[PDB]
């Protein structure tokens, strides 16, 4: 699809078995999921922006759905107010930015 | 252009006749920029980033340029962790998301 920026670029994508609204995020570096479970081992991180930084769990290697494309990668799970899909994984369903 | 995102989707802008770098965020409602002088009033803006809120310092109608591309609107000025081109001006120059 081709979306426009009049909006915020939510889609739906699955993950570890839910449902969830995700923004299609190209100043991420990564994603990053609102609290919830993902099976594996994850080890503690640091991000920040404007406001200031959160802690998150790092999962490697999660499965992703996005409009109907898989791709795998890193997921970073912590108090994130806005799920958001970044660049790890957008580059995998090949999003690219165009004008 | 088409730009990927395997790294940082950053440009050049130029903005008070100077040059700057600054990324392309799609996961941005507007357009952020560093610390500078710019013409007329401005009035208070709070943005919500990831780790929280900020009062930033809003102008409207500033001319600015986006790689190559001339735009003119609203610029926010604050603590950024790097300038930002966020949805509001991202529209302006016809910039859209494609997979
Ligand atoms: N309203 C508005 O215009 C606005 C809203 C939010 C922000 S934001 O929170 O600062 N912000 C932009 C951002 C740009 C660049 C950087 C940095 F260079 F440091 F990596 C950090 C942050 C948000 C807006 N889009 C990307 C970023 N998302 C939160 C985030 C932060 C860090 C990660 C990580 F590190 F995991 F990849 C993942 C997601 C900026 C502007
Ligand atoms: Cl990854
Ligand atoms: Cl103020
Ligand atoms: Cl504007």
Redesign the interface.
């Known amino acids: 699809?081709?979306?426009?920026?009049?909006?915020?670029?939510l889609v739906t994508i699955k993950i570890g078995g839910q449902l969830k609204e995700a923004?299609?995020?190209?100043?991420?570096?990564d994603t990053?999921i609102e609290e919830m479970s993902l099976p594996g081992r994850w080890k503690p991180k640091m991000?920040?922006?404007?406001?200031?930084?959160?802690k998150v769990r790092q999962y490697d290697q999660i499965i992703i759905e996005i409009?109907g494309?898989k791709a795998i990668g890193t997921v970073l799970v912590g108090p994130?107010?806005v799920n958001?899909i970044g660049?790890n994984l957008?580059?995998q369903?090949?999003?690219?930015?165009?004008?």
């Open positions: 699809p081709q979306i426009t920026l009049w909006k915020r670029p923004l299609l995020d190209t100043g991420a570096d990053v991000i920040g922006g404007i406001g200031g930084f959160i409009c494309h994130t107010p958001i660049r957008l580059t369903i090949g999003c690219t930015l165009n004008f």
